[PDB]
Symmetry: C3
Subunit: 287 residues, 3 copies
C-alpha cells in the first residue's frame, strides 16, 4: 500500500515547510487540511481508521501542525480520543517545528555534557515560547534544575505551571526584564539556552564567558543579532575557552534529520504517538 | 501518463475516506476540491477534458462525493452536461457512500437468494433515504416486487416516484408509522432490508424469525441498536433457522472492495459513467 | 529527491488545467494553494527555500497562476523578492495561460516568416489585454515595428507604456474605435494578430485577404465568431492565396506542449525564472 500522510493544520492553509519535510521523510502522498479544530477532526480520523486493515493500517498516518501550539495540542488530543480498540494509526504533533527543534537542541547539549545533566542548574532565557517551554520540559525530565525566565514574572510563571502540569516536573520561573537581570540569572548555571524570538540578542559574550560554572551554551535564534553573542549559527560543539557552543543552524541540521526520521517511523507501526517525549527519545539516538 | 483523479466534494473540505480508497483503487494522484456546486464545477471539468488527448485521456478521471446525495446528484449532472463530443473522461458518483453501499447490499442478497429474485417480494423499511432508495431501484431492476416504507405515506410515495422516474421501474409505497405496522408490512415478503437512520431498531427478532416466507434479511445500520434485532453487524450470510442475515459491517466489507475496484475501472477508458446501475453490475461480479 | 511543485493560484481554488499539465511536465507531486496574495506568499516561499540543500534544492519549484494577470504579477514579484543569495528555487508565471499562449503564437508566426521579422510591421488588434500585450512585447523583441490597437487611445497607450517599461522596447499605440479604423490600421502591415475578448470578430475576411502586404495572420479567439474571418480555428499555417493563417486551436496545440516542457525545466536548476522572455525562448526551440 502507498504511504499516505494526512496533514491537519490549525491555520487557514497547511504549512509548506511541513509538506516538503514530510515527503523527504518517506510519505508517498500527503493530503493536507487547514482550519482543523477539535470539533471537525473526528470525521477526518474516521477516514483513516476504517479504510485499511491489519498491516495495511500502518501505511496511513496523521501529522498535526500549525503556528499555535496550544491549538495543535487540542486537535492532537481530539485525534487520540477518536481512536478506539484496534482502530488507530500512528500520529505526530510538531506545530511550527517546536517539538523537533527543542528535542534536537536538548539532545545535543545533553550529549556534549557527557550524557547526564542531573542535579545541574539550567537556565532558559526567554523561555516562555513553545521552544523554550518544550526545552525546559525535556531538561527537567533529565533531572536538571530549570529556571524559566522572561521579562515579566506572571507570564514566566504561567509557562512553568503549564510545563509542570503537562510533563509532571518542577520548573521554577524568574523575571528578567533587562540584559543585566539576564546576566545575573545565568550565574551559577551549568547550561544556558536562549529561546528568544527571531532576530534578538539575549546574552552577550561577557555575560557567559566569565561565569566559571557555564559548561555549554545553546541558541535557537538563527537570525542576527543572534541570541548568544560571540558564536556563529553553524557552531556545533565549538570550543570557546572552557564553554562549548551550539548555534541555531548546528541545531537545525539535526532537527531536519529528526523530523524526517519521525515521519518514516509513523509508517512502521499503526500505534506510534509522537509528541515531545517520544521525539526526544529518537533525538538522543540520532544526536 | 500518471492516473490523475479529481475529487469534487459538496462539503466544505474533501472526504478523507474517499481519498484513501481512491489511492488503494490505483490512482497515482488525487486532487480534491470542497464547496463544489453545479455552477463552479464546469470550469474544473474543462481542465480535465482539454489537457490530454487520444489514449492519454483515459488516465484522467472524476469522482463526485460529499454528505448530501441530492447535492451530489446535481453536481454529477453538471459534470456530464459539460462533456462535448470526444471531450470527456470517466466519472463516478458516491456521495456518503450511498451507491457503493446499496450496490453491495443488494448484490449480496441476490447472490445468496440463488442469483434471481424475479417476481419475489422485497420490503425496504425506512427506505426513504439515499440508501433505501437506491436499494429499491436495484431490486426493482432485478425484477423483484418492491414496497418502500416510511412513517408517512406522503414522503414514501415521493421517494418511490423519484426512484421510478430515474430508474424506469415500478416501486410501490406504504406507510408504517409504528412497530406494529412495520411487523405487519413484512408478512409474505421473501427479502427484507432495513435502511433506517443510524442508531435505530426497525425490525425486532420477533418480527422476522417467525415469518416463513422470509428467506434473507439485510441491515445497513451499524450502530447499536441495529436495524434488525437478533444479528451481529458482522453477519454476512449467517444462518438463523432457515434464514440468512447480512449485517451492516458484513455488507461494508464488500462495499470497500467494490469502491476500490470502481476507481480502477475509471482509468480503463475515458467514457465510463459509474452511478448506481454500473456500480451494481460490478458488485455482482465481485460478491 | 522527489520533484515537488508548489502551485500558488490567486483565485479561490487552484486551476485544474495547471495541475494536469504540471504532472505531464514531470512533477512528482503538486501542492496547490488558492487565495494567494503578495502578503501571504512569503511564508509559503520560506517553506521551499529552507527545507532542502545542495543538489536537492532544484527538486522544488514554484508556479504562479490564476485568472487575473495583474494579481499574478504581484504575487510573482513578491516571490522573487523573498529569495536572497543561494536561497531560491526556479519559478514560473502563467496566469490564465497568458504567457504560454502569446509565446506559442509569436513563435509560430516568426518561424513561418522564415525565422526573422526584423524591420517589418506587425499590428496587434485589441492588444490591450494580457495576451495582446505579451504578444506585442515578444514581437518588438524580435525587432518588428509594433502597433498596439484598442477602442480608446488612453487605454491603448497605457498598455504600450506598460510593455515598453517592462521589456524595454518601443511599441506604439493607436486608437481603432470601429470596423473602419481597424481595417485602415492593417493596411501596409506584414503581420496581423487579433487578441480580442472571447467570441468577437475583429478582422473581417475582406479586411485582410485583399491587402498584398500581409503575409501571415494569427488569432487567439477560439469561440465563433472568430477574431479573424475566413479562417478555421484549427488552421496552423494553412494557405489562403498568397497568405498563411494560424487559428486559436492551432496555436493552442503548441501552447500545451510548451507549458509541459517549461515545468520540466524548473527542476533542472534552482535559478530559473520563467516569465514571457524565457518561455518564448523555449517556444522557438519547439515550434
Ligand atoms: N528553523 C526552525 O525549524 C525553527 C522552528 C521553531 C523555532 N525556531 C526558532 O527558535 C526560537 C524560538 O521560537 P519560539 O517560537 O519559541 O519563540 P517566540 O514565541 O517567538 O518568542 C520567545 C520569547 O521571546 C521573548 N521576547 C520576544 N521579544 C522580546 C524582546 N524584544 N526582548 C526580550 N524577550 C523578547 C518572549 O518572552 P517574554 O515575553 O516572556 O519575555 C517570547 O515568549 C526562534 O528564534 C525561532 O526562530 C526555529
Ligand atoms: N458505512 C457506510 O459506508 C454507509 C454509507 C451510507 C449509509 N450508511 C448507513 O446506512 C443507513 C442508511 O443511510 P441513509 O443516509 O439512507 O439514511 P437516512 O436518510 O439518515 O435515514 C433513512 C430514513 O430513516 C427514517 N427514520 C428517521 N428517524 C426515524 C425514526 N425515529 N423512526 C423510524 N424511521 C426513522 C426516515 O424515513 P421516514 O421519515 O420516511 O420514516 C429516513 O428517510 C444509515 O444507518 C447509515 O448510517 C452507511
Ligand atoms: N486557450 C488558452 O489557453 C487561452 C488563454 C488565454 C487567453 N485566450 C484567448 O485569447 C484571447 C485574448 O485573451 P485576453 O485575456 O488578453 O483578452 P481580454 O483581456 O478578455 O480582452 C482583450 C481586449 O479585447 C477588447 N475588447 C473587449 N470587448 C470588445 C468589444 N466588444 N469590441 C471590441 N474589442 C473588445 C479590449 O480592448 P479595448 O478595450 O482596448 O478595446 C480588451 O482589452 C481571448 O479570446 C481568450 O479567450 C486563450
Amino acid at each position: 500500500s502507498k504511504k499516505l500522510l494526512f496533514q491537519f493544520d490549525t491555520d487557514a492553509t497547511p504549512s509548506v515547510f511541513d509538506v516538503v519535510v514530510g515527503y523527504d521523510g518517506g510519505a508517498d502522498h500527503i493530503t493536507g487540511y487547514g482550519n482543523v479544530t477539535p470539533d471537525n477532526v473526528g470525521a477526518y480520523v474516521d477516514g483513516t481508521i476504517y479504510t485499511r486493515g491489519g498491516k495495511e493500517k500502518q501505511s496511513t498516518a496523521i501529522f498535526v501542525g500549525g503556528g499555535d501550539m496550544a491549538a495543535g495540542e487540542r486537535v492532537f488530543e481530539a485525534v487520540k480520543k477518536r481512536f478506539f480498540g484496534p482502530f488507530r494509526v500512528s500520529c505526530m504533533l510538531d506545530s511550527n517545528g517546536s517539538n523537533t527543534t527543542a528535542a534536537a537542541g536538548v539532545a545535543l547539549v545533553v550529549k556534549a555534557a557527557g550524557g547526564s545533566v542531573k542535579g545541574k542548574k539550567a537556565v532558559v532565557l526567554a523561555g516562555t515560547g513553545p521552544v523554550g517551554m518544550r526545552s525546559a520540559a525535556l531538561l527537567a525530565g533529565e533531572g536538571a534544575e530549570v529556571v524559566l525566565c522572561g521579562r515579566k514574572l506572571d507570564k514566566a510563571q504561567a509557562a512553568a505551571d503549564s510545563v509542570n502540569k503537562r510533563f509532571k516536573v518542577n520548573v521554577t520561573a524568574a523575571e528578567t526584564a533587562d540584559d543585566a537581570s539576564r546576566a545575573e540569572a545565568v550565574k551559577g548555571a551549568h547550561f544556558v539556552f536562549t529561546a528568544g524570538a527571531i532576530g534578538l540578542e539575549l546574552l552577550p559574550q561577557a555575560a557567559w564567558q566569565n561565569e566559571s560554572s557555564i559548561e555549554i551554551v545553546a541558541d535557537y535564534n538563527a537570525q542576527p543579532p543572534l541570541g548568544i553573542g560571540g558564536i556563529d549559527a553553524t557552531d556545533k560543539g565549538k570550543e570557546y575557552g572552557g564553554k562549548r557552543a551550539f548555534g541555531a543552524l548546528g541545531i537545525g541540521g539535526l532537527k531536519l534529520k529528526l523530523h524526517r526520521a519521525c515521519i518514516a517511523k509513523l509508517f512502521e507501526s499503526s500505534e506510534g504517538v509522537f509528541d515531545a517525549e517520544e521525539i526526544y527519545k529518537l533525538a538522543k539516538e540520532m544526536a
